[PDB]
Design a protein around this ligand. Structure first.
Ligand SMILES: *[C@@H]1O[C@H](CO)[C@@H](O[C@@H]2O[C@H](CO)[C@@H](O)[C@H](O)[C@H]2NC(C)=O)[C@H](O)[C@H]1NC(C)=O
Ligand SMILES: *[C@@H]1O[C@H](CO)[C@@H](O[C@@H]2O[C@H](CO)[C@@H](O)[C@H](O)[C@H]2NC(C)=O)[C@H](O)[C@H]1NC(C)=O
Ligand SMILES: *[C@@H]1O[C@H](CO)[C@@H](O[C@@H]2O[C@H](CO)[C@@H](O)[C@H](O)[C@H]2NC(C)=O)[C@H](O)[C@H]1NC(C)=O
Ligand SMILES: *[C@@H]1O[C@H](CO)[C@@H](O[C@@H]2O[C@H](CO)[C@@H](O)[C@H](O)[C@H]2NC(C)=O)[C@H](O)[C@H]1NC(C)=O
Ligand code: NAG
Ligand code: NAG
Ligand code: NAG
Lengths: 316, 228, 73
């Protein structure tokens, strides 16, 4: 499991610092252009957030789909194939992942923008990739997909790791039983343990903590008489109200700068992770890899992708 | 050979024309220059700002006001300009880190896809990789990946194995295909059927274990020679 | 010509029941484009052309011809 994108957010500057004040807006105007670079950086972060998912998942020219009759030499893909019975076209494991993750309400100048691709299109992309892998093998990554019986594809994979095909062709039943049992076991393990998706919950918790701290910064005196702008304006005279408001302006701008810098660093880390995930999807899924411990412990055969809230999950 | 040479030359001409006509392909290079110039211009324009002082030029303040509070005004100006410089330096640091991250990947691509042939799928271009050529560009490098893509398909019936004398015969490398009546063994990426024989197949046990095995005769090159 | 999406409210373009590849992204799976009327349309994503390989347990597809493609990175 590895994350691919963070929450798409954006915070206004003028409304955040001292929104609903003409005098404070006039004072803030003196500080140059500090109110625009932050918005530019946040918009760049949002664009990169969309780009990460678009690059990771959109790797197929067309949208393949499995034939209606499931006959795969004894291999049973019912746990990972899309389920038309479910109102949302997501497999059982995708539903488990979605239900295993829990959890914008503040409106002080901060907002969240919806992702460009809804989860349904992500599910459709994963379904297309999975169907192409199952039917065409790996030849659909180069040109047009070419159909091939699954047993022969597995024989090719076995020949990939230095084992003759007659090993597989005489042990088809045992291999199929082991694969089905492994699928059942991993499904049960995911459904049972609760701490199996820390690598995705951590990002959400960090972003929520950052936003909560940024909002909580509003109630600090910063050396002035009080943190209530209206009280300062309506209790003191303008000659001293100006200098009192200056301190609050400086402090709030500093807090906003710190939050923006933290967001930039975290976005860079998330981009690195997304690039790694894209490489793994392009190599482990769309083909067979000879790199040790890149696509799982031991010799690698194939991979199956699944979606998850703000991330992708691989089955090696 | 001639067909491949003609295809390669036509592809080279096509990419040359595409570069010559369309001017929007170099966004990944123009973005860096635009960002750097914009940051520099913002930093320069940040100079003319009061930051709460009377005037944006310190010369007017020093030539018009007494030192005891001119020093306070000048101090406010230094604080503002120092904060602006700090912000610019931090942004430059982050951008340089990103450019290093890109440069490492560029070096890896140059090492693998150019100095050798890579088997990593979808790393040196779409399809099966053949080679690459580098080209210089202002603050960047441009790769030309020569790849390989199959074009025209067919339909065939297949079989994992074949009985000939109660044994099972598997192909040394390739697949068994049938054009409706006969059987052939061919490589897995270019249709070229050949007569099945002991030089293309190997034996493994009796043939009542493999699933979906259809039996056909397997030619033997020794008997016709031994007859005469 | 008012339209209500999940990402706000768009005025100046009309909704269309069709679906095409995106030209200008808007959000929540909604894009817009300038067709040909000569107006601006707002529609839903189109992931790609539908396809379904005729998979059978004893069928193969072997290429008989190749092509060399030069790609720029
Ligand atoms: C693939 O495995 C699934 C298990 O997840 C099978 O579905 C179960 O099948 C058993 C009997 O085979 C039934 O008793 C269960 O009620 C089924 N459960 C569900 C949720 O479907 C499925 O039958 C297997 N595939 C095939 C072709 O048999
Ligand atoms: C399948 O391939 C075989 C091998 O080429 C074909 O048999 C030959 O067909 C040619 C004409 O295409 C004849 O001139 C040869 O005399 C045939 N030789 C033998 C041994 O049969 C066969 O016709 C092909 N079948 C189909 C349906 O195309
Ligand atoms: C391979 O050829 C053999 C005959 O050379 C076929 O074996 C016969 O199968 C039928 C039905 O299973 C039996 O009644 C005969 O007794 C078998 N004969 C022998 C000599 O074993 C076999 O059917 C052929 N392969 C396939 C897939 O049909
Ligand atoms: C494989 O494809 C190439 C082109 O993709 C074919 O070459 C063309 O052949 C036709 C004749 O049918 C000529 O008119 C074209 O000028 C050729 N193209 C080029 C670029 O020279 C080639 O014939 C195909 N091979 C087979 C066996 O059909
Ligand atoms: C192979 O057969 C299937 C079904 O008969 C068909 O859909 C497909 O187009 C055929 N392939 C070619 C290359 O004609
Ligand atoms: C392929 O599936 C069909 C069912 O439509 C079956 O009759 C046939 O035996 C299968 N092929 C093999 C080689 O078992
Ligand atoms: C087609 O679009 C019109 C409005 O442009 C809408 O009223 C109608 O319901 C759409 N068709 C369907 C089948 O929903």
């Amino acid at each position: 499991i590895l994350p691919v994108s963070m929450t798409k957010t954006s915070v206004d500057c003028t409304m955040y610092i001292c929104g609903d004040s003409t005098e404070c807006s006039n004072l803030l105007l003196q500080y140059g252009s500090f109110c625009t670079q932050l918005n530019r950086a946040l918009t760049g972060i949002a664009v990169e957030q969309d780009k990460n998912t678009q690059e990771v998942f959109a790797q197929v020219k067309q949208i393949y789909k499995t034939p209606p009759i499931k006959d795969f030499g004894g291999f049973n893909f019912s746990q990972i194939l899309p389920d038309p019975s479910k109102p949302s076209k997501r497999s059982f494991i995708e539903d488990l992942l979605f239900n295993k993750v829990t959890l914008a309400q503040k409106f002080n100048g901060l907002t969240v923008l919806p992702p460009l691709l809804t989860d349904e299109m992500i599910a459709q992309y994963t379904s297309a990739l999975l169907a192409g892998t199952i039917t065409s093998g790996w030849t659909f990554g180069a040109g047009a997909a070419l159909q091939i019986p699954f047993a022969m594809q597995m024989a090719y994979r076995f020949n990939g790791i230095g084992v003759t095909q007659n090993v597989l062709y005489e042990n088809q039943k045992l291999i199929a039983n082991q694969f089905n049992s492994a699928i059942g076991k991993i499904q049960d393990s995911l459904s049972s343990t609760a701490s199996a998706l820390g690598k995705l919950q951590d990002v959400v918790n960090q972003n929520a903590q950052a936003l909560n701290t940024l909002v909580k910064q509003l109630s600090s005196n910063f050396g002035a008489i009080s943190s209530v702008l209206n009280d300062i304006l309506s209790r003191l005279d303008p000659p001293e109200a100006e200098v009192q408001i200056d301190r609050l302006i400086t402090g709030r701008l500093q807090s906003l700068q710190t939050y923006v810098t933290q967001q930039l660093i975290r976005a860079a880390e998330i981009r690195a992770s997304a690039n790694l995930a894209a490489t793994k999807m392009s190599e482990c899924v769309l083909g067979q890899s000879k790199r040790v411990d890149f696509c799982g412990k031991g010799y690698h055969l194939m991979s199956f992708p699944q979606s998850a809230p703000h991330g992708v999950v691989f089955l090696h | 050979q001639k067909l491949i040479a003609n295809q390669f030359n036509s592809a080279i001409g096509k990419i040359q024309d595409s570069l010559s006509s369309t001017a929007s392909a170099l966004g990944k290079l123009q973005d860096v220059v635009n960002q750097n110039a914009q940051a520099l211009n913002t930093l320069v324009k940040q100079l003319s700002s009061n930051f709460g002082a009377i005037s944006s030029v310190l010369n007017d303040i020093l030539s018009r006001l007494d030192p005891p509070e001119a020093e306070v005004q000048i101090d406010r100006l230094i604080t503002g300009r120092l904060q602006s410089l700090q912000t610019y330096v931090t942004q430059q640091l982050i951008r340089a880190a990103e450019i290093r991250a890109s440069a490492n990947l560029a070096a890896t691509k140059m090492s693998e896809c150019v100095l050798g042939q890579s088997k990593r799928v979808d790393f040196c271009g779409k399809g099966y990789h053949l080679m690459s050529f580098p080209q210089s560009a202002p603050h960047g490098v441009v790769f030309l990946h020569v790849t390989y893509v199959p074009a025209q398909e067919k339909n065939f019936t297949t079989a994992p194995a074949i009985c000939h004398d109660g044994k099972a015969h598997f192909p040394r490398e390739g697949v068994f295909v049938s054009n409706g009546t006969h059987w052939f063994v061919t490589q897995r990426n270019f249709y070229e059927p050949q007569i099945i024989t002991t030089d293309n197949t190997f034996v493994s046990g009796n043939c009542d274990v493999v699933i979906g095995i259809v039996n056909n005769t397997v030619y033997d090159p020794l008997q016709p020679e031994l007859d005469s | 010509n008012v339209f209500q999406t999940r990402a706000g409210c768009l005025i100046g373009a009309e909704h269309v029941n069709n679906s095409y590849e995106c030209d200008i992204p808007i959000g929540a799976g909604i894009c817009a484009s300038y067709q040909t009327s000569q107006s601006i349309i707002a529609y839903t994503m189109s992931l790609g052309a539908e396809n379904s390989v005729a998979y059978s347990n004893n069928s193969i597809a072997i290429p008989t011809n190749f092509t060399i493609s030069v790609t720029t990175e």
